[PDB]
Amino acid sequence: MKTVTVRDLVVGEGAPKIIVSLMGKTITDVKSEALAYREADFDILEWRVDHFANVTTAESVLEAAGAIREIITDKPLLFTFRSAKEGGEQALTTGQYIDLNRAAVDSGLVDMIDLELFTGDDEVKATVGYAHQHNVAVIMSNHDFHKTPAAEEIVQRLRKMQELGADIPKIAVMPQTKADVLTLLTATVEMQERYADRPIITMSMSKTGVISRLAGEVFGSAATFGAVGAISVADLRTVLTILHQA
Amino acid sequence: MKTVTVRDLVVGEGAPKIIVSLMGKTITDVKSEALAYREADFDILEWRVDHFANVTTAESVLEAAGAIREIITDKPLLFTFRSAKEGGEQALTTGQYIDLNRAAVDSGLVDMIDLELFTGDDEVKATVGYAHQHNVAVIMSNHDFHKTPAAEEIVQRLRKMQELGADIPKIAVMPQTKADVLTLLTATVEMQERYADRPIITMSMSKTGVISRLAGEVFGSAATFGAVKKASAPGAISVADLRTVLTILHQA
Ligand SMILES: [Cl-]
Ligand SMILES: [Mg+2]
Ligand SMILES: [Mg+2]
Ligand SMILES: [Mg+2]
Ligand SMILES: [Mg+2]
Structure with a gap:
């Protein structure tokens, strides 16, 4: 199986990695949150760009990304605009969203971008290619905040992410029952044994x-997500380490 | 939902309770292990009587049970003879196994006994009744160290344990695949939805x-088993680490 190396971090070997999400409306909010995260124990910093108020002003987005990089210089930076239809704060047109991610790639300030699986196959392939031409990794994502699809559907979305060139397929689904948590784990197992040839991220929310x-x-x-959230990064790392050494 | 209270420990409320297994061949070993276990963080002391060499000498078994209670004075004591049939260290005839468990009940030293589901229905029912008459709780148990039965079969075994009067149905199975681990968890969920009216214990080993x-x-x-130095079945973690994880899940 491929691992994915981002700076010195190796995703897909050792214990699962920890992603935290930074959410700020203004440049001063982004700076304040970056300062709050600076001493926390995590591996990847995700900037949740959909929270940012001035997302359609290219210079403002660039300034904010730069501000994060100035404060946190030792953690890979993941650029994520999460659409409202997948739990995010706002919607963009397809063209605006693709342009936004290409501008992030161009900046040299981000190590990874998040691309939503169902953005459009042609747009996803082109943007994966563009990211790769600049040595930017792609987490290709899908979220269901309302329910848990059948395991087979979860597997087929993860397989499609690989087909479209994701470095790391990622899916997150909402359990309505205990069996739904098990469904997500079953999909994870099946994907791993049958199809995976690179690292994958799966999560049951709530x-x-x-x-x-x-x-x-x-x-x-x-990898998984913690908070500085359903769980603190310190407690997440504590458990991950125990289980890695079990 | 009935809970099971032993001393003042409540099984079936809050976070899962931690069981450790004490194994010793002689009275001397029983005493040294008990002293070594005294400071560990756990809730229920399981004495694995099948490891004891002198199991057919009533005086010896009684002396060892007393020794455990003298050293570990603040933990519920579970008396478990694990049959060779179900992965234990030695075999007794059915009658000797039943007599051993009745003598444990009679001792006044044990809070719980383990009775294996497949011992025989008449014997199990009689011994459950005897334990209950002396305010001793029964963990009724089943083990498969080779495979994981279908989820519906696991459910039906746990249901049957309830029918026979178990205070706490208990099953431990061995996965052959990762999916089998998830099957054991599925059975756990389904038992809770369809039949449970008391605490159950389930485990997938390795x-x-x-x-x-x-x-x-x-x-x-x-409840769940953790290791002091070494647990009986494959896949355990230390009791301190187990308590850490259980507490995080309880507060999440
Ligand atoms: Cl064990
Ligand atoms: Mg260029
Ligand atoms: Mg391992
Ligand atoms: Mg009597
Ligand atoms: Mg609770």
């Missing part, structure tokens, strides 16, 4: 799904 | 099954 963040290593999820 | 030792609160297992 309080009910938190076991999928903690005890995911055996089943085949290479 | 490293692959460790989630099943951690996730009792969300899927429906009321």
Whole structure:
């Protein structure tokens, strides 16, 4: 299986990695949040660009990315605009979203971008290519904040992400029942044994799904999310380490 | 939902409870292990009587049980003879096994006994009744160290344990695949939805099954085994680490 190396971090070997999400409306908010995260124990900093108020002003986005990089210089930076239809704060047209991610790639300030699987196949392929031409990795993502699809549908979305060239397929789904948490873990196993040839990230959201963040290593999820959220980064790392050494 | 209270420990509320297994061949070993276990963080002391060489000498078994209670004075004591049939160290005839458990009940030294489901229905029912008459709780148990039965079969075994009067149905199975771990968890959930009216304990063994030792609160297992130095079945973690993880899940 491929691993994905981002700076010195190796996703897909050792214990699962920890992603935290920075959310700020203004440049001063982004700076304040970056300062709050600076001493926390995590591996990847995700900037949740959909929270940023001035997302359609190219110079402002560039300034904010730069401000994050000035404060946190030792953690890979993941650029994520999460659409409202997948749990995010706002919607862009397809063209605006693709242009935004290309501008992030161009900046030299980000190590990874998030591309939503269902953006459009032609747009995703072109943007994956563009990212790769600049040595930027792609987390290709899909979220269902309302329900958990059947395991087979989850697997087929992860397989499509690989087809479209994702460096790291990522899916997050909302459990309505305990069985739904198990469905997400089953999909993770099946994807791993049948199709995966690179690291994947899977998560069952909400309080009910938190076991999928903690005890995911055996089943085949290479990273998960903590908070400085359903769980603190310190407590997440504590459990991941215990289970990695079990 | 009935809970099981032993001393003042409540099984079936809050975070899952931690069981450790004490194994000793002689009275001397029983005493030294008990002293070594005294400072460990756990809730229930399981004495694995099948490891004891002198199991057919009533005086010797009674002396060892007393020794455990003298050294570890603040933990519920679970008396478990694990049959060779179900992965234990030695075999007794059915009658000797039943007599051993009745003598444990009679001692006044034990809070719980383990009775294996497949011992025989008449014998199990009689011994459950005897234990209850002396305010001793029964963990009714089943083990498969080779495979994981279908989820519906696991459910039906746990249901049957309820029918026979178990205070706490208990099953431990061995995964052959990662999917089998998830089957054990599925059975746990389904038992909770369809039939449980009391605490149950479920486990998938080996490293692959460790989630099943951690996730009792969300899927429906009321207790879990941890290691002091070494646990009996594959895949355990230390009791300190187990308590750390259980507490994080309880507060999440
Ligand atoms: Cl064990
Ligand atoms: Mg260029
Ligand atoms: Mg391992
Ligand atoms: Mg009597
Ligand atoms: Mg609870």
